[PDB]
Design a protein around this nucleic acid. Sequence first.
RNA 1: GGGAGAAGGCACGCUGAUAUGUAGGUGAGGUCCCUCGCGGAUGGAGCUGAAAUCAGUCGAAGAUACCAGCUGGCUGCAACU
RNA 2: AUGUUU
RNA 3: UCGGGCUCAUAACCCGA
RNA 4: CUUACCACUUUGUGAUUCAUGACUGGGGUGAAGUCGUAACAAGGUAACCGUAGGGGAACCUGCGGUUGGAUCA
RNA 5: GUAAAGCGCACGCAGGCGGUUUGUUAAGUCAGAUGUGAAAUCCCCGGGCUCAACCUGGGAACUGCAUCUGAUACUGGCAAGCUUGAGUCUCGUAGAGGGGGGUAGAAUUCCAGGUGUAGCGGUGAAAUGCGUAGAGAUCUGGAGGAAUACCGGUGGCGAAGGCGGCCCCCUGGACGAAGACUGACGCUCAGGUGCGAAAGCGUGGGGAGCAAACAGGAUUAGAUACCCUGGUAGUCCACGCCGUAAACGAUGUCGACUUGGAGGUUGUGCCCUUGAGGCGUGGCUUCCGGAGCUAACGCGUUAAGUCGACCGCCUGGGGAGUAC
RNA 6: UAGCUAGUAGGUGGGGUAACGGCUCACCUAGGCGACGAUCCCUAGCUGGUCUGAGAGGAUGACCAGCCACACUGGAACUGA
Lengths: 129, 88
Amino acid sequence: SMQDPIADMLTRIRNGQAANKAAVTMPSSKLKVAIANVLKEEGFIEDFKVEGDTKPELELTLKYFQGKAVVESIQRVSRPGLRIYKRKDELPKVMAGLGIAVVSTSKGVMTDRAARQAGLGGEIICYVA
Amino acid sequence: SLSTEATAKIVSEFGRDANDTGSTEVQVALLTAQINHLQGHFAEHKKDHHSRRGLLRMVSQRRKLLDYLKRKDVARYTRLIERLGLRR
RNA sequence: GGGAGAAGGCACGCUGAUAUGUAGGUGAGGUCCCUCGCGGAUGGAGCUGAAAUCAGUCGAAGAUACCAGCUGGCUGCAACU
RNA sequence: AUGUUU
RNA sequence: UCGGGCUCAUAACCCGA
RNA sequence: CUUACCACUUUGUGAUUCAUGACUGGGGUGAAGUCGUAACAAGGUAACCGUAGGGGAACCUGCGGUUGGAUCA
RNA sequence: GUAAAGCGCACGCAGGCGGUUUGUUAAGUCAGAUGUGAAAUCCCCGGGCUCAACCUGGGAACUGCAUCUGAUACUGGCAAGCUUGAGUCUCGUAGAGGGGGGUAGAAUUCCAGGUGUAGCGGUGAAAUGCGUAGAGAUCUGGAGGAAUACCGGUGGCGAAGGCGGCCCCCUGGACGAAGACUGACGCUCAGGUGCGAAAGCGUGGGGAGCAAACAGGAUUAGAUACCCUGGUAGUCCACGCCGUAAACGAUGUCGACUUGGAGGUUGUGCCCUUGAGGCGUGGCUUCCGGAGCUAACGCGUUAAGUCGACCGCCUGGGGAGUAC
RNA sequence: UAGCUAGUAGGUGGGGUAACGGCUCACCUAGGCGACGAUCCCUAGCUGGUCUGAGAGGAUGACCAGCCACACUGGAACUGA
Ligand SMILES: [Mg+2]
Ligand SMILES: [Mg+2]
Ligand SMILES: [Mg+2]
Ligand SMILES: [Mg+2]
Ligand SMILES: [Mg+2]
Ligand SMILES: [Mg+2]
Ligand SMILES: [Mg+2]
Ligand SMILES: [Mg+2]
Ligand SMILES: [Mg+2]
Ligand SMILES: [Mg+2]
Ligand SMILES: [Mg+2]
Ligand SMILES: [Mg+2]
Ligand SMILES: [Mg+2]
Ligand SMILES: [Mg+2]
Ligand SMILES: [Mg+2]
Ligand SMILES: [Mg+2]
Ligand SMILES: [Mg+2]
Ligand SMILES: [Mg+2]
Ligand SMILES: [Mg+2]
């Protein structure tokens, strides 16, 4: 938004699915995709397209199961002026491991799993679930 | 406001490049002008607690945008103010 | 603005040194300059001369004489000269 | 107007 | 002041003496 | 012996804090005291806010504002 | 929002926060290593007292601090930019936006003159008050002050307070159209600065109407009121001051999103324009309401929905927004 | 409590300590500290740790152990590692 970008992103999706929306959109950004991969490649979205070599556009194709949405439990965390950082023995574990928390480790951003799997900490992001 | 015939003049004098309304050089000059003019007007009435606000809004921007220079290309800042004697 | 010299205190002589008399003040030669002299600049001889700090010293006492606010607190009245 | 009473 | 009325009841109000 | 520093201690003048003080502002309790009835219904002049003046008391009145106002205005 | 709680409103320093891409740095951060964080409590396992209390071995632990070397995703710094944020230019658009200066017509009051005569005015009735010194009414002339009917509206403009006849001058903001230019220059903001309804205060002016105070008349058991007759401050102006309000959407500002329906108002593109109109797209604005939110009432794309940046504030009632 | 501070902040050279240093002295500059809260007022020995608590957090610092300070009150130096 007119301050913190990513914040809006996580919202856009949670909002859309809230009203069985097709697929919300937002101006794509390198960090936006790094968090996008951990969605399509982590089972949470169909896929994301692009548009604009100079004026990009992210496209998170939401999903829904039986009679409810898929990604129905997302929230930001390491927001500005409150950024959170934790060590390996502090790493998160979204909803008792049942969920996932995007973590921007020194070795690229990746799901909570790859965090311990790779053995290292990173800028915790959201609590996808 | 400044006569339409005015702005188009100052710009061709301060505008970083031939005919351009956007750079600080042009921004400032275009502002300082209306500020210097209104000064006399305000020397009259002086009760217009409304028109004066605009005087501030734009003046508050003068010192404001003038900073952009420092925070950015300082080489021109001094070269720009030395033109209208501003800051002093 | 005042009240306020509120109140209440400290130091005050003299000798020597800093400095053979100091800072400051005054300013003669000599040099320079130009209408060119009741000129200027520069020069600092001489003259004069506070004040401070040290150290030392005499008496009972150094603003020693003459001279020269007593001070504060509560209240009436009337602004005030 | 009041009622533990204009 | 008193006696009667008015009110659920007081005062007030009305009547009478 | 002398000087320097300095303790006990002396003096003046303020700051601060505690206790106390004739009388007194407002406040709080308490005995079915006396005077009203201001407010809650359109509370019987709709109420309240600022503010100003006045009156035994609630309060009254003026100016602006609010609805946190009744009726078929 | 209404339970305690959004400064009355703006501007803005510090402070906090920061669209996007690349390069660089490696400070925040992550990884591993090392010193070090006394022992003893504590805890895990295990021993010694007959058990237990207690005693005791080892280890874990001691978030910590620093240092060494690495990692570079995000954050921060530097360099280079980019454009959607924000800003300038052009042309227009509406409006009670503001300050100043003139001017207009209706009406009240007063004064004057004619006509005309025993009432007017007021109230629930009355009375005070005004009338034969001729009112009231009716007509003619003049003075003055304040306010701008109809328009006018859920209408408009403004940060808020607030701002209406007409005209001129000076002047602030908003909005739409094409592009052109700037190139994150932005958001918020303790303190600080400025604006502030009404009443009130100081100086000098002004004074028709209304009216605190006050004086009569009336009502009443009383009536320092409500009602009537009068009426001073004030209400008006210029300058200066006070800064309060149920300064109210009782809802801080900015930005991003999430069904829709009818109306208002104001730009602009377009359709036999071929109509009033038919279809778009913006700025602001009412009523309704959907998911959701909510203790409920209700709010509902102008949120009280879902998110983020910054700030202000709340923490039982009375005492008291009082005392010092 | 919103201002605070002259050996005060720094610089020269003397002096001094076991040793750095206004530690002290002379002179010189006029600094230094403060809302990231100085100065001032009240209170208190600090820690490991202790209690409580799911944890974060809150409360606490007796006996055990480390550190500091004190020894009738105020002051001072002597001996000596
Ligand atoms: Mg007497
Ligand atoms: Mg006299
Ligand atoms: Mg009674
Ligand atoms: Mg009684
Ligand atoms: Mg007392
Ligand atoms: Mg009543
Ligand atoms: Mg009433
Ligand atoms: Mg409340
Ligand atoms: Mg507000
Ligand atoms: Mg330990
Ligand atoms: Mg970077
Ligand atoms: Mg508006
Ligand atoms: Mg006024
Ligand atoms: Mg006045
Ligand atoms: Mg609704
Ligand atoms: Mg030295
Ligand atoms: Mg103690
Ligand atoms: Mg708990
Ligand atoms: Mg002793």
